[PDB]
Symmetry: C6
Subunit: 70 residues, 6 copies
């Protein structure tokens, strides 16, 4: 296992399938919404209010319903 | 990147944003300028922010990238 | 030299479905099984599955002895 | 855009011996003048001089406005 | 080089099987013996082996003095 | 402006002249001792006794007395 071989498809699936996710920050704050876009550094989280999240600040990404990866 | 168009949009359009630090602290103002590692946030006081200490950037209003 | 320990270790936990505790850098403790992982993240399965960034992990503690191949 | 903003800013602050406050990621506030810097550290001069790792800095806040050109 | 200090330091602790304290950036204190290590993690053996990410480590403190 | 052009001379100086220093960690903690050595990633802090410190965990290094740098 190497590179983003898991992260990319995982996030890309949450995105393509517009899955409601909770994103827990290292500082203990919880964000919620849908992944609109992402790259090596950040994730765009769309909600009542959209926002750009730095991945280096993310602890865990918890999908609201189970997700199967290709 | 997603980061560059995003921030440059906020800059160009002078969008009021809230930057939450990696320690919970919130900063408010406008993205005056930025490079790969820092952002200049202009308010009644202008200040340089290290991206590495940012958790999330939240625009006051919705924005769209071309 | 960076992978020679980490990957065999994570893979072994994965292959043998060993229950692990994953302590986060903010002091929170997660539990489950290592379903998959790459260079940057780990997929942890419990009743509720979740993706964990390695950069937020301090330590990984298996529920029982794990021998490296 | 690389250091295009960071170098000029820091170099300007150093050149003009501008008083600054440096807030660390842990909320701690340092104060004094930027005497020098490299890719990783800043030398902050005051009654006590000290070497600050950039990785530990949240924000750098000048005591007065600065003109952008290095 | 890249590791001219870190490697010999950790290797010596691994060889002499010296009991060490590993303080994490978040305060917590781990204890045991360095069983093995690579560039990014340390395997710390106590009641059972735990893998410690180097990025989360503040300081490594041996129970007794060590010569490089 | 590039590399450890400042970090190395400074750290090398503290080591050469065996200056007592305080090293404040990102978590607030404060370590004291003398810089015995360092490389790209860590600093060896000689006290009673020697402690390896990750640079990634350090916020600031404060010498006990003023320190001049070469040229
Ligand atoms: Zn890998
Ligand atoms: Zn990716
Ligand atoms: Zn860019
Ligand atoms: Zn627009
Ligand atoms: Zn086994
Ligand atoms: Zn090495
Ligand atoms: Zn530069
Ligand atoms: Zn160096």
């Amino acid at each position: 296992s190497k590179g983003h071989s898991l992260q990319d498809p995982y996030l890309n699936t949450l995105r393509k399938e517009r899955v409601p996710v909770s994103i827990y920050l290292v500082n203990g704050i919880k964000l919620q919404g849908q992944i609109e876009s992402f790259d090596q550094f950040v994730i765009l989280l769309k909600n009542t209010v959209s926002q750009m999240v730095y991945k280096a600040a993310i602890s865990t990404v918890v999908p609201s319903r189970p997700v199967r990866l290709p």
